Amino acid sequence: QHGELQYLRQVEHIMRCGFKKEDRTGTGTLSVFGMQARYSLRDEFPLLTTKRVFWKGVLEELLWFIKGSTNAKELSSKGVRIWDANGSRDFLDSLGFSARQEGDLGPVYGFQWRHFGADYKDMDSDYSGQGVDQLQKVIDTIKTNPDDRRIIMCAWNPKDLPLMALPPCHALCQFYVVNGELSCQLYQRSGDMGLGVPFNIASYALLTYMIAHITGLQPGDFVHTLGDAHIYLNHIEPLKIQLQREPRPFPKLRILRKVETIDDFKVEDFQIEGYNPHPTIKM
Amino acid sequence: QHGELQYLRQVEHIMRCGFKKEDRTGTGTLSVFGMQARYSLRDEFPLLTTKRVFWKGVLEELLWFIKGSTNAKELSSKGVRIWDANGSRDFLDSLGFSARQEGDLGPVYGFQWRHFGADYKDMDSDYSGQGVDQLQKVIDTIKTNPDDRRIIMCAWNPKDLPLMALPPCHALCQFYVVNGELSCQLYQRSGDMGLGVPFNIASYALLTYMIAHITGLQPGDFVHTLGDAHIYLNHIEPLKIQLQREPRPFPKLRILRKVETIDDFKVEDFQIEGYNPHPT
Ligand SMILES: Cc1nc(=O)c2cc(CN(C)c3ccc(C(=O)N[C@@H](CCC(=O)O)C(=O)O)s3)ccc2[nH]1
Ligand SMILES: Cc1nc(=O)c2cc(CN(C)c3ccc(C(=O)N[C@@H](CCC(=O)O)C(=O)O)s3)ccc2[nH]1
Ligand SMILES: O=c1ccn([C@H]2C[C@H](O)[C@@H](COP(=O)(O)O)O2)c(=O)[nH]1
Ligand SMILES: O=c1ccn([C@H]2C[C@H](O)[C@@H](COP(=O)(O)O)O2)c(=O)[nH]1
C-alpha cells in the first residue's frame, strides 16, 4: 500500500463520520477529534501526489524557521506569500497590535524554537544568546544520547500566547531513535485537511531529513497526530474529486552536499526527484 | 467491542513488532514510537479490568495536581506513595538538588498547570496570583467558546526543565467540544504499558469527567496518544498472562454531588461502581 492512502482514508473518514462544527470565522467545517498517520521516510518523501503541494514554500518556510525569524517580509521576499496575510497592517490591528510594525508576526515558531522563554519585544530585536535553543538541544541529545525519551521541541508557550498573531498549530514535536533511524512525531492541535495538512506533513518530514542528515542517522517514520482534524464546507466538492485520483509513487529527496550544522543548510542543497503529481486544485 | 481491547492490542503489538531499546537505567525495553487509542467516556469509565488499577491513587494524585502542590509528602500522607521515591533525599541528590528539601519535586504538573512561567523557588513558596493558570483557562474557554481549537493545558516547559526531578511524561493535553460533549487528547511522550499507562488513562479520563461536570457538558472520548510506548523486558511474562484474560465490562463513575468549581472537588464526591477486575 501507498503511503498517501492514509491521508486519503482520513479525509474520507472526516466526510463520512465528521460532525458539522463552527469555525473561528464562521465558515463551517466537518471535523473529527484525534487522528494519526505514519508516513515512511525510508527511501521516499511524503510529498502528496493527488494534489500538487507548494514544495518551494515548505522549504523556504522551514529555513526561515531555523533562521529564527518572525518577520513575514523575510519569507515573502523569497517568493513565499503564505504568512503575509497574518502580517498585514489591517490584520495585526484587528487584534490590537497597533504599534507592532508590518510583517512582525510576534513570538512564533522561529522565536520559540530558538529562544523559548525569552522576553519578546519586536521582530528586529536581538535575541542572541537568549532563551532556550530547543532546535540545537534536540540535535545534541540525538547525538550524545539516542535512547532519550525527552527529545522534545515545544512551540506552544502559554505565557507568550497573548503576543501571537496566530497560536502555533503545531504545539510540539518529539524525536526518537532506534536501529540507527530517526523518527518524528508531531502534535498538530488543529489541521485543515484540504490545504494546510499536506504542506505540514512535507514540512516536518523535511525537518527530520535535515536533522537525520546532520546527526548521521537515516530517516525513519513521521507520525502525524491531529487534534481537531477538519474539512471546510466549501472544500467538500473539490476534495470528493481528489479522492477519486490514484496516488502516484512518492518522489525522493536528495541532499546534494554534506552539511555540518542545521544553520548551514541552503536551498541549493535540496533536490526533489520524480515529483509527478496530478493537476493542482484551488482551495 | 470492549474498550480495553485497544490497550490489549497495543501491548500485543509492542511484543510482536517492537524493537529492543535501552532504558535510562539500562533495564531494557521493547518499544514502538507513536501510538493512539480512543476510549469512550459515554456511560462508562476506562478503568482497565484485566489487571487491577490503583484507583485510590489516581484520584488522590489528580486532586493533588489541581491543588497545585509539588510536595510529595502531601500526596503520601493521603496513602498514595507513588511520587515518594522521586522525593527522597538520596534521589534528589543524585541529580544535584542538595539544598532542595525532602519531598520537593520541583516545578512539576501542579505548578505548571496553575502557574506556568512563574519563577519557582521551593514547594513551600507562595505562588498566589503568579504565572498562567492554565487549568482555569481551559474551563473558562470551554464555557464561553466551545468551538475553540486552542484549548490546551501544557505541562511541558523547556525553561523549567532543569529544575525538575522528572520531566513530564504528559507533555500536554487538549480539550474539544461537539454535540454538547467534552473530549480530551493526551500527548504522552513516554509510556510504560505495564504500569503507568493504565493508571494514566484513568487519570485523564477522570479529569475530563470533572471538567465536563463543571462546564455542564457530557463526557465524550479520551484519545490517548503515545510517543515511546514501551514494555520492560521483565514484564513480558506476566503481560503474556494478562493478555490471556478477557476484559470484564467497565465500571461507571458517579459524582455524588453538584460541585461548582474545579477546586471544590473532594474525594467523597466520587464513586466507582461495578469495578470487577481480574486478580493478580
Ligand atoms: C483557515 C486556514 N487554513 C489553513 O490551512 C491555513 C494555512 C496557513 C499557512 N500555510 C502553512 C500554508 C500552506 C500553503 C498555503 C497556500 O496558500 N498554497 C497556495 C499558494 C500561494 C503562494 O504562492 O504563496 C495554493 O495551494 O495554491 S498556506 C495560514 C492560514 C490558514 N488558515
Ligand atoms: C519504569 C517506570 N514505569 C512506570 O510506569 C512508573 C510510574 C510512576 C508513577 N505512576 C503514576 C504510578 C502509577 C501506579 C503506580 C504503582 O506503583 N502502583 C502499585 C503500588 C500502589 C498500591 O497499589 O498500593 C501497584 O498498583 O501495585 S506508580 C513512577 C515511576 C515509574 N517508573
Ligand atoms: O500549518 C497550518 C496552520 C494553520 N492551519 C489551519 C487549521 C485551522 O484551519 C486554522 C487555525 O485556526 P485556529 O485553530 O487557530 O482557530 O489554520 C493548518 O491547517 N495548518
Ligand atoms: O505516569 C507515568 C509516569 C511515568 N511512566 C514511566 C514511563 C517510563 O518508563 C518512565 C519515565 O522514563 P523517562 O521517559 O523519564 O526516561 O516512567 C509512565 O509510564 N507513566
Side-chain angles (χ1 to χ4, degrees), chain A residues 2-3 9 17 54 57 75 80 105 107 116 136 147 168 171 189 219 237 256 262 264 270 276 278:
Chain A
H2 186 109
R9 283 187 199 107
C17 312
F54 184 24
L75 174 76
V80 179
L105 301 169
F116 188 94
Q136 197 56 244
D147 298 297
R189 56 159 195 83
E237 292 310 321
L256 307 181
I262 195 64
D264 194 28
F270 305 98
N276 165 35
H278 280 264

Side-chain angles (χ1 to χ4, degrees), chain A:
Chain A
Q1 280 170 102
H2 186 109
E4 188 148 0
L5 284 187
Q6 291 179 89
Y7 164 92
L8 291 186
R9 283 187 199 107
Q10 291 188 299
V11 185
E12 205 168 301
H13 187 265
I14 290 178
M15 276 172 207
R16 213 120 76 228
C17 312
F19 283 84
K20 179 281 200 304
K21 196 183 172 197
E22 287 301 334
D23 190 43
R24 190 228 308 91
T25 82
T27 304
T29 62
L30 278 196
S31 92
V32 170
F33 181 65
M35 279 179 124
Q36 162 163 299
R38 175 186 304 279
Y39 302 104
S40 176
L41 301 171
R42 304 177 191 78
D43 260 295
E44 57 175 77
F45 196 74
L47 211 58
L48 296 197
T49 65
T50 56
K51 159 180 170 169
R52 172 171 297 284
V53 183
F54 184 24
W55 169 257
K56 185 224 172 189
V58 337
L59 178 40
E60 290 291 349
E61 183 202 61
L62 186 56
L63 299 167
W64 175 59
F65 282 156
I66 302 172
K67 168 171 51 194
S69 176
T70 58
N71 180 8
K73 309 189 104 179
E74 187 58 24
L75 174 76
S76 182
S77 62
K78 270 69 219 298
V80 179
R81 250 62 78 168
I82 69 187
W83 286 112
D84 287 331
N86 293 70
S88 66
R89 193 81 301 272
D90 280 291
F91 183 83
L92 294 191
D93 279 335
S94 70
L95 304 177
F97 318 108
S98 294
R100 174 100 118 239
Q101 86 188 254
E102 236 218 321
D104 192 341
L105 301 169
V108 291
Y109 299 69
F111 177 86
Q112 295 304 340
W113 281 7
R114 308 306 217 127
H115 312 278
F116 188 94
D119 296 11
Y120 190 89
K121 299 301 178 182
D122 54 57
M123 60 180 208
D124 288 315
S125 286
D126 180 47
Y127 306 111
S128 59
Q130 308 187 31
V132 180
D133 189 343
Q134 295 191 262
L135 186 35
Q136 197 56 244
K137 256 292 116 57
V138 324
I139 293 172
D140 296 339
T141 303
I142 291 179
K143 282 176 184 167
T144 68
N145 184 35
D147 298 297
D148 203 88
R149 309 189 281 221
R150 314 111 166 249
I151 306 177
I152 288 150
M153 182 180 216
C154 189
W156 189 270
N157 187 338
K159 181 240 281 301
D160 283 340
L161 246 45
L163 311 177
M164 301 179 206
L166 182 79
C169 276
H170 315 302
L172 105 184
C173 69
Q174 172 183 195
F175 294 105
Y176 170 95
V177 193
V178 88
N179 306 340
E181 292 179 349
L182 181 74
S183 282
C184 183
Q185 171 155 33
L186 162 76
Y187 190 75
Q188 187 176 354
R189 56 159 195 83
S190 169
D192 181 358
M193 305 301 277
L195 186 64
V197 167
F199 180 103
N200 299 142
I201 305 166
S203 218
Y204 283 84
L206 174 51
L207 178 60
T208 303
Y209 264 86
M210 295 194 179
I211 296 185
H213 175 281
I214 293 173
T215 51
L217 304 161
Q218 297 298 136
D221 279 312
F222 170 57
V223 179
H224 181 44
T225 295
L226 286 163
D228 187 343
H230 50 286
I231 296 178
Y232 285 98
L233 297 176
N234 29 107
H235 296 179
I236 310 246
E237 292 310 321
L239 282 170
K240 271 193 284 183
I241 290 165
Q242 179 180 353
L243 287 166
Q244 309 298 323
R245 278 111 112 115
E246 278 205 35
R248 309 213 236 257
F250 275 131
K252 312 205 181 308
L253 177 71
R254 254 88 200 202
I255 293 188
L256 307 181
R257 82 168 221 254
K258 170 149 165 49
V259 2
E260 289 163 53
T261 59
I262 195 64
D263 313 88
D264 194 28
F265 279 111
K266 287 123 186 175
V267 207
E268 325 86 47
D269 307 337
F270 305 98
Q271 173 71 320
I272 285 290
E273 293 185 19
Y275 185 46
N276 165 35
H278 280 264
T280 315
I281 304 177
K282 295 306 176 78
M283 302 188 78

Side-chain angles (χ1 to χ4, degrees), chain B residues 154-221:
Chain B
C154 190
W156 191 268
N157 179 328
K159 187 253 271 296
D160 285 341
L161 253 36
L163 301 177
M164 298 176 211
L166 168 74
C169 248
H170 318 304
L172 112 203
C173 68
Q174 180 186 194
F175 294 102
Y176 171 104
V177 193
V178 88
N179 186 2
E181 299 181 340
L182 179 66
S183 298
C184 176
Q185 174 158 25
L186 166 75
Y187 190 78
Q188 190 174 346
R189 64 170 189 69
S190 156
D192 181 353
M193 299 300 274
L195 180 61
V197 161
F199 179 108
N200 289 150
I201 303 180
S203 222
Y204 281 90
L206 169 62
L207 177 60
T208 306
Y209 260 70
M210 297 190 189
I211 305 181
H213 179 269
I214 289 177
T215 58
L217 301 158
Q218 295 303 112
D221 289 303

